[PDB]
Design a protein around this ligand. Sequence first.
Ligand SMILES: C[C@H]1O[C@H](O[C@H]2[C@H](O)[C@@H](O)[C@@H](O[C@H]3[C@H](O)[C@@H](O)[C@H](O)O[C@@H]3CO)O[C@@H]2CO)[C@H](O)[C@@H](O)[C@@H]1N[C@H]1C=C(CO)[C@@H](O[C@H]2O[C@H](CO)[C@@H](O[C@H]3O[C@H](CO)[C@@H](O[C@H]4O[C@H](CO)[C@@H](O[C@H]5O[C@H](C)[C@@H](N[C@H]6C=C(CO)[C@@H](O)[C@H](O)[C@H]6O)[C@H](O)[C@H]5O)[C@H](O)[C@H]4O)[C@H](O)[C@H]3O)[C@H](O)[C@H]2O)[C@H](O)[C@H]1O
Ligand SMILES: [Ca+2]
Ligand SMILES: [Ca+2]
Ligand SMILES: [Ca+2]
Ligand code: NA
Length: 481
Amino acid sequence: TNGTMMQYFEWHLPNDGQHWNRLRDDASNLRNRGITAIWIPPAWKGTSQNDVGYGAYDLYDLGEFNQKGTVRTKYGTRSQLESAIHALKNNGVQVYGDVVMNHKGGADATENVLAVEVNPNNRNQEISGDYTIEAWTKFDFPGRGNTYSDFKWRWYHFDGVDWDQSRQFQNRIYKFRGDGKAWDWEVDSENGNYDYLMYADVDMDHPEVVNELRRWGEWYTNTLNLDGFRIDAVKHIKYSFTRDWLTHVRNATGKEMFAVAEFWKNDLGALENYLNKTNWNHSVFDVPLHYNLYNASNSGGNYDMAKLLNGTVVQKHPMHAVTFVDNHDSQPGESLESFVQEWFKPLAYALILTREQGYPSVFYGDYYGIPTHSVPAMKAKIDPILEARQNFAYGTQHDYFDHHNIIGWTREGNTTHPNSGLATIMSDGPGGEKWMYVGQNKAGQVWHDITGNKPGTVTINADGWANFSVNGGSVSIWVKR
Ligand SMILES: C[C@H]1O[C@H](O[C@H]2[C@H](O)[C@@H](O)[C@@H](O[C@H]3[C@H](O)[C@@H](O)[C@H](O)O[C@@H]3CO)O[C@@H]2CO)[C@H](O)[C@@H](O)[C@@H]1N[C@H]1C=C(CO)[C@@H](O[C@H]2O[C@H](CO)[C@@H](O[C@H]3O[C@H](CO)[C@@H](O[C@H]4O[C@H](CO)[C@@H](O[C@H]5O[C@H](C)[C@@H](N[C@H]6C=C(CO)[C@@H](O)[C@H](O)[C@H]6O)[C@H](O)[C@H]5O)[C@H](O)[C@H]4O)[C@H](O)[C@H]3O)[C@H](O)[C@H]2O)[C@H](O)[C@H]1O
Ligand SMILES: [Ca+2]
Ligand SMILES: [Ca+2]
Ligand SMILES: [Ca+2]
Ligand code: NA
């Protein structure tokens, strides 16, 4: 059976503490639609109650301590999360936790630290003399005390900050002075060295930090019975640290732990470097495919559809690609805004859901809508595609990426999964037809469009061929009636 992940949040969810409850209520529903794994938002305490969670204050506070002016996170309390996960586990759905280790925000107090300024466009270049700044580096976790962990963070656990509380200049980055203080390596080389991103940057060279993060990893996994991870911001984290952290947590827990890493760069070469340096021990989001889809959706029919997979992770390394259409960063108004246009969106979902390559991810914002911006729920359009993946998308695949508008592929089905087999056909331009092979054994069967976009039927010929059709700017998915 085909695996399907859902990203179960978007940026603009309400701060009503109800999100874990929503997830609990949806557990049977998701299982029935073919969702086999859920990626939950940051579960820990952020810099405030309405923090999406990437301003990660205390990784041991899952909405259970009174810190940052709130007990619950944005999403709910720890006991509410724990019953949502039980509901999921009871329905055979796996749970992936987000993992934010690059930085810590929302320090309890400042410290006076000797620092040097570096060039924001080249963090290898020092551009000032040394001087003392007031840095937000002191974390004591007053609400939690020493429960679960007695580790306290101080300036020397960090490499630098972008904020001097005493002077309050913008567009500065401060590297701390001290013995063996340097930006970590290997990290992405955009801006010279891209170790520094935001908040207080974690020093992955520091042996107490490495030990603390490994131990937090086991604790998080065990406390919540997680089946895997989505790892945040990996281009800004020393590559060998991520590789060995994951191995550690897998060894310590005895579980396989699937992991997908967010390496945000539209560059297949950079992604292959990352995968080589981490020894192929986890997957990456297919960021190049997201940009291909985004650009195709904006090209008004003029994109060359035969080239839709060129330069992508899924084309080259299918077993290490998590495919997606949109996420909380590409949604309107957000940091990496590059939202796939609504008319193309069912085509993009058919591409990732009905081909044999890659591990696909459905976005909450697409499925349930983004009411704050004007994005309607596309549940009605995505559901039949999820049904095709669940029941029909099996067996040998035949690809027809051979025209600038009209492309398609077929699946022959297999003997496990009866009635399985399909022909997907789509056009970014005018409608039309394509001759495609579904298998000699399907001769004489009558097929219909599961999307309901094309009314009518198609009878498979004596040799296993049929002329499948599609409307303009549309997708049809043909299966046995
Ligand atoms: C979003 C994405 O970013 C990166 O991607 C880059 C990319 O790498 C780069 O290459 C390029 O991409 C291009 C591609 O390469 C191309 O190939 C392609 O073609 O085109 C692309 C061009 O678009 O650009 C990209 C975007 O820049 C990165 O690589 C990705 O990984 C990343 N996505 C993931 C990463 C995330 C981080 O976890 C996450 O980001 C979210 O969430 C962020 C955090 O909320 C948010 O960040 C923004 O907002 C922050 C908060 O405002 C801001 O922080 C700054 O300001 C703070 C003040 O608010 C500073 O805090 C310090 O000072 C305060 C005062 C302190 N508070 C005190 C004070 C008090 C009162 O006295 C009290 O209230 C408190 O209690 C006290 O403590 C505090 O403690 C201090 O620490 C802070 O230091 C500042 O940094 C961030 O800077 C700002 O960025 C993101 O916007 C958002 O997206 C993603 O969701 C995740 O998926
Ligand atoms: Ca870093
Ligand atoms: Ca360092
Ligand atoms: Ca075209
Ligand atoms: Na660092």
